[PDB]
Short mmCIF file of C-alpha atoms in Angstrom, two decimals:
data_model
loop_
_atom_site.label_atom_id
_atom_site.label_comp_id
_atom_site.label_asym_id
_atom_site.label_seq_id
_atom_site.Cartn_x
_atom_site.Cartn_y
_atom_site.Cartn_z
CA UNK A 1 101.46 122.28 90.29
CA UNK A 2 99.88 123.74 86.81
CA UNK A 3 101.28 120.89 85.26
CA UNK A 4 100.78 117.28 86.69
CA UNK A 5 97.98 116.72 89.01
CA UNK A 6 98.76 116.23 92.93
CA UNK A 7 96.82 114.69 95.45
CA UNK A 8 97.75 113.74 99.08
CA UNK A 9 96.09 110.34 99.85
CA UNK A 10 97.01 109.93 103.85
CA UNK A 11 101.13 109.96 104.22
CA UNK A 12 101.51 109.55 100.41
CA UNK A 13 101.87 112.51 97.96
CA UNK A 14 100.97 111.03 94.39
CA UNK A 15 101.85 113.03 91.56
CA UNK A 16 100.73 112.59 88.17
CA UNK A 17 102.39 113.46 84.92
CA UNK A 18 101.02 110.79 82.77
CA UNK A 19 100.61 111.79 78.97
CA UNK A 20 101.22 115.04 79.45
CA UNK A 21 103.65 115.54 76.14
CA UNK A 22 106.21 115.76 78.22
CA UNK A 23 109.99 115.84 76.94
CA UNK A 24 111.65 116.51 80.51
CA UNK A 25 110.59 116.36 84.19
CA UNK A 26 108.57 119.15 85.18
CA UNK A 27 110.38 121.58 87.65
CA UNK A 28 109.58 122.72 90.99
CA UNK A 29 107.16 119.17 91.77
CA UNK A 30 106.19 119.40 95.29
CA UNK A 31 108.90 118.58 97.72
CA UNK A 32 107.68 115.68 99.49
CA UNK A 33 106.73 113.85 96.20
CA UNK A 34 106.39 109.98 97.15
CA UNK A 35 105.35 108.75 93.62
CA UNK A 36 105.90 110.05 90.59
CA UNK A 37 103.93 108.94 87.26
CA UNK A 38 105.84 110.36 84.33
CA UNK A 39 104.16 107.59 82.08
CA UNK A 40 103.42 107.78 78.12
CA UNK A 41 105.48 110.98 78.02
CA UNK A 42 107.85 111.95 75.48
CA UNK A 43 111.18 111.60 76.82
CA UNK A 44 113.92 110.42 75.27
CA UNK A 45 116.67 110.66 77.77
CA UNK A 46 116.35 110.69 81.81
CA UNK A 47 118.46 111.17 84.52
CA UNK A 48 118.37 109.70 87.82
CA UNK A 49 120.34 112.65 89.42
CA UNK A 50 117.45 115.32 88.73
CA UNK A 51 115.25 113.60 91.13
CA UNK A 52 117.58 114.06 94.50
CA UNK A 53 115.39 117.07 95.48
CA UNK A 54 112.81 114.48 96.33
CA UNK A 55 114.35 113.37 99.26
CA UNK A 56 110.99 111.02 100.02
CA UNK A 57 110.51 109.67 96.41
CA UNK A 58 109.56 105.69 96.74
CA UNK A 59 108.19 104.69 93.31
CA UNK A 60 108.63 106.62 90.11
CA UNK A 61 107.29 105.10 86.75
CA UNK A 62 109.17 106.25 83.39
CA UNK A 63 107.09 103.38 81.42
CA UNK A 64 105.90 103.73 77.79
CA UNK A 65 108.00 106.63 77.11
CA UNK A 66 110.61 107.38 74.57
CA UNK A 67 113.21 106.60 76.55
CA UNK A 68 116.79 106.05 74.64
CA UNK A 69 119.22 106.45 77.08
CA UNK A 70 119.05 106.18 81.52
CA UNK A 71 121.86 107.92 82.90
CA UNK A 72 122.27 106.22 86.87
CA UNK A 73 123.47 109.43 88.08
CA UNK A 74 123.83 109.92 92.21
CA UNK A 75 121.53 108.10 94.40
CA UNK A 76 117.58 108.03 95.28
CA UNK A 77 118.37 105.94 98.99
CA UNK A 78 114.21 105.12 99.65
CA UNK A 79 113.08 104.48 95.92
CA UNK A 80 112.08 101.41 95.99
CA UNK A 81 109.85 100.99 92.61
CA UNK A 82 110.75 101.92 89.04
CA UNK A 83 109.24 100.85 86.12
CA UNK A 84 111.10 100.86 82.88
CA UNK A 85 108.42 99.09 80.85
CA UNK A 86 107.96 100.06 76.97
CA UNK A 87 110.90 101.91 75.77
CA UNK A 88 114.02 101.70 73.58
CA UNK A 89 116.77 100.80 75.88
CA UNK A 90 119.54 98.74 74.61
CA UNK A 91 121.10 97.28 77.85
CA UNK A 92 120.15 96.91 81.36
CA UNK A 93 120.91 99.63 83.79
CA UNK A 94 123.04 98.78 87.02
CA UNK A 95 121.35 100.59 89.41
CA UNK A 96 122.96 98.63 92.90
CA UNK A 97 124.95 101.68 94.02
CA UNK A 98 122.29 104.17 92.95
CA UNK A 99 118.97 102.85 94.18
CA UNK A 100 120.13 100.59 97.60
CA UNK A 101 116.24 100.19 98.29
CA UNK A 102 115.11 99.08 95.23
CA UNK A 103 112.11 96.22 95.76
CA UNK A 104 110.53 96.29 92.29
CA UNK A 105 112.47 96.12 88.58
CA UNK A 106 109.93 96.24 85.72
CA UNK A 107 112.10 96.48 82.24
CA UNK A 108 110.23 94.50 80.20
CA UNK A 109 109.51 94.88 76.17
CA UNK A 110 112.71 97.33 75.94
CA UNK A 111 115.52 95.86 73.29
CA UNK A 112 117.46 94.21 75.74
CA UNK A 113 119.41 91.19 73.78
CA UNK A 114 121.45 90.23 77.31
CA UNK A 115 121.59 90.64 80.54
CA UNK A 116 125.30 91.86 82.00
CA UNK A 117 127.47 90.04 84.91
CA UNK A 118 127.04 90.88 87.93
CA UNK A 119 123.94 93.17 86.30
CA UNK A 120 122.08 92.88 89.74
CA UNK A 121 124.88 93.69 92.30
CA UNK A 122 123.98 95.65 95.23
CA UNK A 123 119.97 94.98 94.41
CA UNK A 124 119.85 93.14 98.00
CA UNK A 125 116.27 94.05 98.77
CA UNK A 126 114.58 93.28 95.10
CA UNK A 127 111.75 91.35 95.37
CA UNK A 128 110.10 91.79 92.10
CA UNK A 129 111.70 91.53 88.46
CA UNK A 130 110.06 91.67 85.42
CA UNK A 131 112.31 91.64 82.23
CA UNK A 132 109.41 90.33 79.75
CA UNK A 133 109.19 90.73 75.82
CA UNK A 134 112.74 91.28 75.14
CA UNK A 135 115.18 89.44 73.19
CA UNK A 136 117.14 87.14 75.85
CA UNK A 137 118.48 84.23 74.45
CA UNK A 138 120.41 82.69 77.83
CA UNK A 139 121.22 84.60 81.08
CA UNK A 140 124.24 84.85 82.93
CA UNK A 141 125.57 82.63 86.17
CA UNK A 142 124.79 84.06 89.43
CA UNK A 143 121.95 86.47 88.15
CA UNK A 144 119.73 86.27 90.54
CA UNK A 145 122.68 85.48 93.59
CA UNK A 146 122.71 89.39 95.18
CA UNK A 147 118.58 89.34 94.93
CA UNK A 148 118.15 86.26 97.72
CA UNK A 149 114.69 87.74 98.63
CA UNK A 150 112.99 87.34 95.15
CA UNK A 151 109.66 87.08 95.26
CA UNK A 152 108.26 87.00 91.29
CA UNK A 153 110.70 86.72 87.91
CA UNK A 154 109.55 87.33 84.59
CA UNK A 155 111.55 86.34 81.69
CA UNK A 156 107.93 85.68 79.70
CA UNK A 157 108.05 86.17 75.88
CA UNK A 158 112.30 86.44 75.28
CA UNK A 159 114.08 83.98 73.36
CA UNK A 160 116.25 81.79 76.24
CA UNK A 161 117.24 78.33 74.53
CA UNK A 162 118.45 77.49 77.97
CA UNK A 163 118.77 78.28 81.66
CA UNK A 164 121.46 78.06 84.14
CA UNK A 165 121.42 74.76 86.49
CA UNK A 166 121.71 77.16 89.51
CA UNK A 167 119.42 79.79 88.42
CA UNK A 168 116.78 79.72 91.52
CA UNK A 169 119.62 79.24 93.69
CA UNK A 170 118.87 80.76 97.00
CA UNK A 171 115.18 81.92 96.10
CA UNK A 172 113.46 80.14 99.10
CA UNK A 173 110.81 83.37 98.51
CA UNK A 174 109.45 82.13 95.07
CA UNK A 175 105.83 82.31 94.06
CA UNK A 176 105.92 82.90 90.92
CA UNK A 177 108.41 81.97 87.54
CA UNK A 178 106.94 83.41 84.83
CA UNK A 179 108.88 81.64 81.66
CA UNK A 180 106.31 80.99 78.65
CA UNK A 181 107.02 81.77 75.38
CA UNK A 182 110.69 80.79 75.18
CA UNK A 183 112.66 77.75 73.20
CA UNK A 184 113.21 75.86 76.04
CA UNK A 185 113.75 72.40 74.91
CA UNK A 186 114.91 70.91 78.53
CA UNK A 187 115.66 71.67 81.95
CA UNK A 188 118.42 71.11 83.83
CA UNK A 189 118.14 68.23 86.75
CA UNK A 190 117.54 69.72 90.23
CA UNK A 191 116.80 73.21 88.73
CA UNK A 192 113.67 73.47 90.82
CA UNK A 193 115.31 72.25 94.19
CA UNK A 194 112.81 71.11 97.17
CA UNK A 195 111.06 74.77 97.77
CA UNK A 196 107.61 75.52 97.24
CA UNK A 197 106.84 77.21 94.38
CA UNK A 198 103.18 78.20 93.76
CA UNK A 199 103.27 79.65 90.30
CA UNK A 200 105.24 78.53 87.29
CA UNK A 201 104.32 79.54 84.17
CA UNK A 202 106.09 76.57 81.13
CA UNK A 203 103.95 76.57 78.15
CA UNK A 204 105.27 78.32 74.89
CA UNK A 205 108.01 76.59 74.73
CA UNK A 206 109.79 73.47 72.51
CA UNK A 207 110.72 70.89 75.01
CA UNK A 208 112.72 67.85 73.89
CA UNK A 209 110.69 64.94 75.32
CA UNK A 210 113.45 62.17 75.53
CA UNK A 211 115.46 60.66 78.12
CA UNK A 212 116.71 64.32 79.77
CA UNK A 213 113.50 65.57 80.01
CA UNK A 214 112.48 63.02 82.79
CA UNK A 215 113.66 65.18 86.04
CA UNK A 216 110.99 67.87 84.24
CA UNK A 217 108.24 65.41 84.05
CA UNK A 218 108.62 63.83 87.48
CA UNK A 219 108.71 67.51 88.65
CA UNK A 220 105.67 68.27 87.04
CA UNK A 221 103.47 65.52 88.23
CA UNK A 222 104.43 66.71 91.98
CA UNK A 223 103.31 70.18 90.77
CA UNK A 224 100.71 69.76 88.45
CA UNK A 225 98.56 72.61 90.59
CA UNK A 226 101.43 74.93 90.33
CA UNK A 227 101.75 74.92 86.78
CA UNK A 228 99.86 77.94 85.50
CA UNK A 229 98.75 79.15 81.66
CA UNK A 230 98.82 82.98 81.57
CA UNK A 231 96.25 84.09 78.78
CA UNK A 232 95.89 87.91 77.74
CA UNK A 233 93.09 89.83 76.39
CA UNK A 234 91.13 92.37 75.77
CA UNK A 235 91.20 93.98 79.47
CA UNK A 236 91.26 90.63 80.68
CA UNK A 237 94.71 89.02 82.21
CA UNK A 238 94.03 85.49 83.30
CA UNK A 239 96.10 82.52 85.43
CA UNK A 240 94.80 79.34 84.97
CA UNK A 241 95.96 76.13 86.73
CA UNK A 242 97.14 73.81 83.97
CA UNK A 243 100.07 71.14 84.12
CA UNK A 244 99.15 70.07 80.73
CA UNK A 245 100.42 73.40 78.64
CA UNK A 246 103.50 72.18 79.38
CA UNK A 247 104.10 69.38 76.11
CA UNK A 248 106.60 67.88 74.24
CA UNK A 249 107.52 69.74 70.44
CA UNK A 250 105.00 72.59 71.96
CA UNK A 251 102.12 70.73 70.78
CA UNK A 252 99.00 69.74 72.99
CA UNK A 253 99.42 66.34 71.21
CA UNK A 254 101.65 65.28 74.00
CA UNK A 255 102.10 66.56 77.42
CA UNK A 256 105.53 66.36 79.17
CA UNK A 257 104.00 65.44 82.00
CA UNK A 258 103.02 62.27 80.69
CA UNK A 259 105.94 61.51 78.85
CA UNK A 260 106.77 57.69 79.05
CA UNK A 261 110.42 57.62 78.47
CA UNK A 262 110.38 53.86 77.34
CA UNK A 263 113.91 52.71 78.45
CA UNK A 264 115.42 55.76 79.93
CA UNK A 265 117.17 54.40 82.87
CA UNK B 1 71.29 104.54 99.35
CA UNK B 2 74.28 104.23 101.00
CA UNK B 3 77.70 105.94 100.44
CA UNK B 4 80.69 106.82 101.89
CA UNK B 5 84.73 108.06 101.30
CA UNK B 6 87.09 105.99 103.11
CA UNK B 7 90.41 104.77 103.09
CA UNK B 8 89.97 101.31 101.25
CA UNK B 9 91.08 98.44 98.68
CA UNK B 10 88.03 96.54 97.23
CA UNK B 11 88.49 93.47 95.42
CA UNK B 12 85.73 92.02 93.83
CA UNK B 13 85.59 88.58 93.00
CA UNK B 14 82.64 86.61 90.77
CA UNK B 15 81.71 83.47 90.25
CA UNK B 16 81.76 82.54 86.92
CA UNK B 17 79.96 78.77 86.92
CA UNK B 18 77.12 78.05 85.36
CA UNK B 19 75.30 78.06 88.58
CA UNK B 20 74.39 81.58 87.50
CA UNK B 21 72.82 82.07 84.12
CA UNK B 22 74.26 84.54 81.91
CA UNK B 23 71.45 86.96 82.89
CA UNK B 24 71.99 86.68 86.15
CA UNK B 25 75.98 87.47 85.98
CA UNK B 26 74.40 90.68 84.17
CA UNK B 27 72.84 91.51 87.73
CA UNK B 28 76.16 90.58 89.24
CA UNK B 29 78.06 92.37 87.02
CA UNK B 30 75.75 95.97 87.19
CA UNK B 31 76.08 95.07 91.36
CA UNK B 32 79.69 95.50 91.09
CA UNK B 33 79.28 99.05 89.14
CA UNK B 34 76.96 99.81 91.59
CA UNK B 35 79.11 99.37 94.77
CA UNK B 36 81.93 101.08 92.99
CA UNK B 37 80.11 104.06 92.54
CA UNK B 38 78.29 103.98 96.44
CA UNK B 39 82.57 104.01 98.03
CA UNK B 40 83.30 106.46 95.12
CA UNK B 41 86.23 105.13 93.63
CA UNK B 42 86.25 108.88 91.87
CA UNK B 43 88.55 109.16 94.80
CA UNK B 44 91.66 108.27 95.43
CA UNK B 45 90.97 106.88 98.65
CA UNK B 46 89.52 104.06 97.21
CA UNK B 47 91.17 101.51 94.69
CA UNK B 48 88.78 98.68 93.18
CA UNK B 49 89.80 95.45 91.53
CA UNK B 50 87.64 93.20 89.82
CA UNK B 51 88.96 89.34 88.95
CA UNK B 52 86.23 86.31 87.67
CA UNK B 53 87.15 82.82 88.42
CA UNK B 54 86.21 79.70 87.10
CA UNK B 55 89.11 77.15 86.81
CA UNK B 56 91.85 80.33 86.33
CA UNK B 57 91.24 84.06 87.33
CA UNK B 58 90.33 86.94 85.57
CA UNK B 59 91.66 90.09 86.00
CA UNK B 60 89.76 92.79 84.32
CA UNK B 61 90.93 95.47 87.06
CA UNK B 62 93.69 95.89 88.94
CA UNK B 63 94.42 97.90 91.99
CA UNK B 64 97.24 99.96 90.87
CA UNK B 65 95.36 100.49 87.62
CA UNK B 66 95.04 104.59 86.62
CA UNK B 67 92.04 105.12 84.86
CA UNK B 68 89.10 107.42 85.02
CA UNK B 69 85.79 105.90 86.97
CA UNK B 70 83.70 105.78 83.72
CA UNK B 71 86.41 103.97 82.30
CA UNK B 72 86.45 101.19 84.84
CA UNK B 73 82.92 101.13 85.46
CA UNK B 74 82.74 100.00 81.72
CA UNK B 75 85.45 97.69 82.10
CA UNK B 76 83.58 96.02 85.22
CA UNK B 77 80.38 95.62 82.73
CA UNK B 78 81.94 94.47 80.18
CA UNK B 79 83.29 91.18 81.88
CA UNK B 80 82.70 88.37 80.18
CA UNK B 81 80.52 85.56 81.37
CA UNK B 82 82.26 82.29 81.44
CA UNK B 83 79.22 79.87 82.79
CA UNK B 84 81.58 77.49 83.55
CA UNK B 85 81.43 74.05 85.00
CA UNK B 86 83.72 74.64 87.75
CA UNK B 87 84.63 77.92 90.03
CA UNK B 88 86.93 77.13 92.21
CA UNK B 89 87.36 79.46 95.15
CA UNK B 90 90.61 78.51 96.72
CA UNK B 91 92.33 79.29 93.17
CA UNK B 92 90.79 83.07 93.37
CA UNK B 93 91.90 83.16 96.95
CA UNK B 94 95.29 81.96 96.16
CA UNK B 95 95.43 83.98 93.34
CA UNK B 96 94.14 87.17 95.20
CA UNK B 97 97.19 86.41 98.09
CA UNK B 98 100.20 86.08 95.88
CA UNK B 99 99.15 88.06 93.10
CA UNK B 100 97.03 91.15 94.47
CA UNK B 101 97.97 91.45 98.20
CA UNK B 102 101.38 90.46 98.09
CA UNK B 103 102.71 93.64 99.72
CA UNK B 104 101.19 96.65 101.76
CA UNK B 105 102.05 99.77 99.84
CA UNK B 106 99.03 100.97 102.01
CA UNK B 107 99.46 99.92 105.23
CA UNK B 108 96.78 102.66 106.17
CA UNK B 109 93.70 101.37 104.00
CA UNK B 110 91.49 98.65 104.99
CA UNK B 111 91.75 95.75 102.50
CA UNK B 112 88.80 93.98 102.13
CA UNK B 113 88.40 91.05 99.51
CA UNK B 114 84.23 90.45 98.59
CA UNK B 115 83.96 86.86 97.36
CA UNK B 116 80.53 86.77 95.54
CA UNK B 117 79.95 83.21 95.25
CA UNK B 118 77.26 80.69 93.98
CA UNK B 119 78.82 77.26 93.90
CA UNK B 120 80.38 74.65 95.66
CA UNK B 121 83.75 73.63 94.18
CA UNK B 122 85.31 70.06 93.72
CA UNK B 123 86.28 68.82 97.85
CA UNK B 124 89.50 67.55 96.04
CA UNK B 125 90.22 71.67 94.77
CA UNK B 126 89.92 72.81 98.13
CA UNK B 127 93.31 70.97 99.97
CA UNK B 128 94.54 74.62 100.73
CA UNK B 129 91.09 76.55 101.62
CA UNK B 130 92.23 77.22 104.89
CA UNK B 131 95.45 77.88 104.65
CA UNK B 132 94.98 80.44 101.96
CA UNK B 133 92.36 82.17 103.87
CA UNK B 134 94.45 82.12 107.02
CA UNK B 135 97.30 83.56 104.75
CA UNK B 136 94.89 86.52 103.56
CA UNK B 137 94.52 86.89 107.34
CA UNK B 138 98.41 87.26 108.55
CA UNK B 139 98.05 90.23 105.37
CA UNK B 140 95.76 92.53 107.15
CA UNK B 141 92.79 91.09 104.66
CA UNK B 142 89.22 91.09 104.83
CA UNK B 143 87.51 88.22 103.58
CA UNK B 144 83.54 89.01 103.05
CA UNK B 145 81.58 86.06 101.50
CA UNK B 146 78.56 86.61 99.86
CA UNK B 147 76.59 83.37 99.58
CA UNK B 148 74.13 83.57 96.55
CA UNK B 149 71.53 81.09 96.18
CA UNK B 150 71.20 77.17 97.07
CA UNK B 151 74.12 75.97 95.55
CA UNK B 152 76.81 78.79 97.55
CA UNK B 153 79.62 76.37 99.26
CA UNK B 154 78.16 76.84 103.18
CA UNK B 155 81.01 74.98 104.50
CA UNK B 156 83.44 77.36 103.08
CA UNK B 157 81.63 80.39 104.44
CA UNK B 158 81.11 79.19 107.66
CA UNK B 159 85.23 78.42 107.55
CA UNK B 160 85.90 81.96 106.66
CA UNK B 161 83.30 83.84 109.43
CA UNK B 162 85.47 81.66 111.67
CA UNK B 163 89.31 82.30 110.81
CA UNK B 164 88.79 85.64 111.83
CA UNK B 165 86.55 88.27 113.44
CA UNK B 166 85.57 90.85 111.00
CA UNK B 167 85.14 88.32 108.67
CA UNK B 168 81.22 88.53 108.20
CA UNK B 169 78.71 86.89 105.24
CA UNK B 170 75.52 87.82 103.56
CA UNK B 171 73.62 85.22 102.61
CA UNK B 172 70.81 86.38 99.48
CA UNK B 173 68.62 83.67 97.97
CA UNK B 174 69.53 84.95 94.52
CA UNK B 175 71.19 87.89 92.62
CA UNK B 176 68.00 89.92 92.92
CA UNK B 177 68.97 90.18 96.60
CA UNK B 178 72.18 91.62 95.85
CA UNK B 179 70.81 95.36 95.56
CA UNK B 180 68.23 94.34 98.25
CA UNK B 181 70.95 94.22 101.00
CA UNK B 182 73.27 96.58 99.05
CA UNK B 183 73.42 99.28 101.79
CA UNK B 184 73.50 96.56 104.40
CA UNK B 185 77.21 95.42 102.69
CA UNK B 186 78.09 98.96 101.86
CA UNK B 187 77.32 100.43 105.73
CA UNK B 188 79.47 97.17 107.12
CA UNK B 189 82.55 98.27 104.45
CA UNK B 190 82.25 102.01 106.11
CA UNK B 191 82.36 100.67 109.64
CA UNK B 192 85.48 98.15 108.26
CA UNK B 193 87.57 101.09 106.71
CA UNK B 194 89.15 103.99 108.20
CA UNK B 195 87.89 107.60 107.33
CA UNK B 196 88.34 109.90 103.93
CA UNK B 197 87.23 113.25 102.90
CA UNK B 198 84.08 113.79 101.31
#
């Protein structure tokens, strides 16, 4: 191609468009394209439909873009990653009937301000879901029922003053529940269940140490190694092991997890 | 010197205690440049990844991660020295089995994992050693410990030579010995890894 750069690494054909100044999908891409990077590109508008010709497309990354508008046009039956990271979209797209195979969801720092009913219908394979930096304030029931085989959530850095009793529901596949930077102020009894859950990211957040919060601090005792700090830097993305982010008002003057609770029967 | 083009995922993992001076992470850090240029991660064949751990893990390079070789080889120097009191190896290896090899969009590559280390950490941090290792295992993983000096956790690197075959350790009294058996470590990786164009 005299545009993007190809190169087949075994039974993969990678193309790359990144930062190209592109405004629309290059034609005539190689026909057994398996990943497409159309990345830091200026495109304002994309449609799904264009990309049929590639009947062996599996990931295709439309991140940090200028993307306005996502028309879920026909279907791409063995994509099965798409990030949507770093662009101007006002609402999540259903894609359920349009990518069947989809494993990994990355939408985060868009201008989402809720997520839809019924938004992740027909998703049954998604394993990975990353919807962090944009402006949720509470999700809706049964989000996460149709994705049974989620393996990492992201909700990091929106503005959720509460989740749903049932929201892990069904996720015996958990590792890690990314959910710092939030106004949480409590959680809901039972929300974590019995499963295993390696990573759970709590700090960031406003919780209301008083009688309700008790089901979170008994919780957190059992899992004080699986109660992580995400810290981001300059190149550097770190997970450290720390029950003690997790504290009363937000401030390390208090942790939750060591939250008395006088005469809270 | 030794190179080579192959099919391969390298993650590189370093100790960040203080059982290495600042100085001495230098050396470990301009090891790690070293070994990415010997594979030749100008390829695509190759992906690197570079994480520190002390009590969390650092990321400064991930797999998936498109950038130009010069780029990441000035990344991987630019890590920053933690000279921490505790390094704690089963939180890098749990870290590097949920969070880096979750999945096998490469079923084809070899994916090898080099755990430079130089400590021992706390018997009470290391509950799921085994079972993390074992779990790096059932993923097709690689796990090559590289004891350096007299304070490298022995009893964890014996346990990993054991959970599996290919599993083999270099043992170098001190990060001077790190370029010393360089080729050694880079002609085992060649022999691990399936074969890529030159």
């Amino acid at each position: 191609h005299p545009i993007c750069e190809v190169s087949k690494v075994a039974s993969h054909l990678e193309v790359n468009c990144d930062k190209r100044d592109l405004t629309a999908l290059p034609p005539d891409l190689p026909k057994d394209t398996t990943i497409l990077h159309l990345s830091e590109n200026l495109l304002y508008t994309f449609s799904l439909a264009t990309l049929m010709p590639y009947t062996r497309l599996t990931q295709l990354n439309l991140d940090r873009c200028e993307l306005t508008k996502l028309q879920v046009d026909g279907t791409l039956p063995v994509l099965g990653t798409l990030d949507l990271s770093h662009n101007q979209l006002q609402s999540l797209p259903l894609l359920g009937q349009t990518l069947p195979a989809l494993t990994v969801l990355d939408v985060s720092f868009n201008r989402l301000t809720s997520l839809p009913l019924g938004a992740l219908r027909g998703l049954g394979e998604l394993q990975e879901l990353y919807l962090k930096g944009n402006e949720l304030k509470t999700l809706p029931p049964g989000l996460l029922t149709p994705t049974p085989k989620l393996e990492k959530l992201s909700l990091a850095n929106n503005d959720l003053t509460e989740l749903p009793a049932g929201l892990l529901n069904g996720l015996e596949n958990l590792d890690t529940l990314l959910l710092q930077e939030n106004s949480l102020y409590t959680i809901p009894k039972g929300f974590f269940g019995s499963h295993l859950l390696p990573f759970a990211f709590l700090h960031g957040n406003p919780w209301l140490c008083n009688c309700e919060i008790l089901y979170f601090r008994r919780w957190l005792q059992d899992n004080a190694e699986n109660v992580y700090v995400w810290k981001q830097g300059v190149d550097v993305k770190a997970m450290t092991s720390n029950v003690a982010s997790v504290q009363c008002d937000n401030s390390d003057k208090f942790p939750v997890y060591k939250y008395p609770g006088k005469g809270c029967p | 010197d030794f190179y080579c083009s192959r099919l391969l995922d390298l993650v590189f993992l370093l100790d960040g205690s203080s059982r290495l001076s600042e100085a001495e992470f230098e050396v470990l850090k301009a090891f790690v440049v070293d070994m990415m240029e010997r594979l030749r991660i100008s390829q695509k064949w190759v992906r690197v990844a570079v994480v520190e751990y002390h009590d969390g893990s650092h990321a400064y390079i991930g797999l998936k991660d498109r950038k130009r070789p010069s780029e990441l080889r000035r990344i991987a120097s630019q890590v920053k020295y933690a000279g921490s009191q505790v390094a704690s190896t089963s939180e890098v290896l749990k870290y590097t089995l949920f969070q880096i090899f979750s999945k096998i969009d490469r079923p084809e590559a070899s994916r090898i994992a080099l755990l430079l280390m130089a400590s021992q950490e706390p018997q009470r941090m290391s509950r799921n050693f085994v079972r993390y290792v074992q779990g790096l295992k059932k993923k097709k993983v690689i796990v090559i410990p590289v004891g350096i000096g007299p304070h490298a956790n022995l009893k964890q690197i014996r346990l990993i030579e054991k959970q599996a075959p290919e599993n083999k350790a270099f043992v170098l009294s001190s990060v001077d010995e790190l370029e010393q058996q360089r080729d050694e470590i880079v002609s085992y990786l060649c022999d691990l890894a399936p074969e890529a164009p030159p």
